[PDB]
Design a protein around this ligand. Structure first.
Ligand SMILES: Nc1ncnc2c1ncn2[C@@H]1O[C@H](CSCC[C@H](N)C(=O)O)[C@@H](O)[C@H]1O
Length: 199
């Protein structure tokens, strides 16, 4: 299931593969939210195909309608929004992504990343190519935990090899365009943590 404007339609594996062809890279943003973050990445890189995934279609209507417009009016040819959850395991997305991100997750998705939930993270890893770079950026309250051997080993069992943990600040988050990220950036001082590496 993908969005075309405000309408949900089906995109097949063959149709997807065809679109991917005009691009050298594929990036997946899981729990993409309002689509503004992915919109900004896409407008800045026309040789990557961006796939934003979120179970809430309603919050994607604005940007989904925007990417459908003609290029002169803000349309884009390198973005698709898939309506699905981290639990969903859509077969079409298996072994497709050069990179995968989970940015500022909340609700169930946050706990899956933080706990972590090994099975769910495995579903996310299954969407990545052998190469695959990953990036999880989290915050809760407003580094030692993510650097721990236990967390490292649990991610490794899910297919994620941590190469770096970095503590980031509000200023860093100000770069993102989602309304959620802006709230996080503009509010109280908060610690943000990026756990990145390869699949
Ligand atoms: N189990 C799950 N699978 C996929 N997405 C989920 C999820 N649980 C929550 N989410 C999504 O995660 C989002 C958290 S808020 C938006 C975060 C977004 N990446 C941003 O930076 O703006 C919500 O849109 C929510 O629908």
């Amino acid at each position: 299931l993908i969005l075309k404007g405000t309408k949900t339609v089906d995109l097949s594996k063959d149709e997807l593969t065809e679109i991917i062809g005009q691009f050298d890279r594929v990036h997946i943003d899981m729990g993409t939210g309002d689509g503004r973050n992915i919109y900004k990445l896409a407008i800045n890189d026309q040789n990557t195909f961006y796939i934003g995934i979120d179970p809430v279609k309603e919050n994607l209507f604005d940007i989904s309608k925007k990417i459908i417009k003609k290029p002169s009016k803000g349309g884009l040819s390198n973005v698709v929004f898939v309506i699905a959850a981290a639990e969903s395991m859509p077969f079409e997305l298996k072994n497709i992504a050069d990179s995968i991100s989970i940015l500022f997750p909340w609700g169930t998705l946050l706990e899956y990343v933080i706990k972590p939930n090994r099975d769910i993270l495995s579903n996310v890893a299954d969407m990545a190519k052998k190469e695959a770079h990953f990036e999880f950026v989290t915050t809760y309250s407003d580094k030692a935990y993510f650097l721990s051997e236990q967390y490292k080993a649990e991610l490794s069992n899910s297919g994620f090899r941590i190469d770096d943990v970095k503590e980031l600040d509000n200023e860093y988050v100000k770069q993102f365009n989602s309304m959620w990220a802006k709230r996080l950036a503009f509010g109280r001082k908060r610690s943000f943590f990026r756990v990145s590496g390869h699949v």
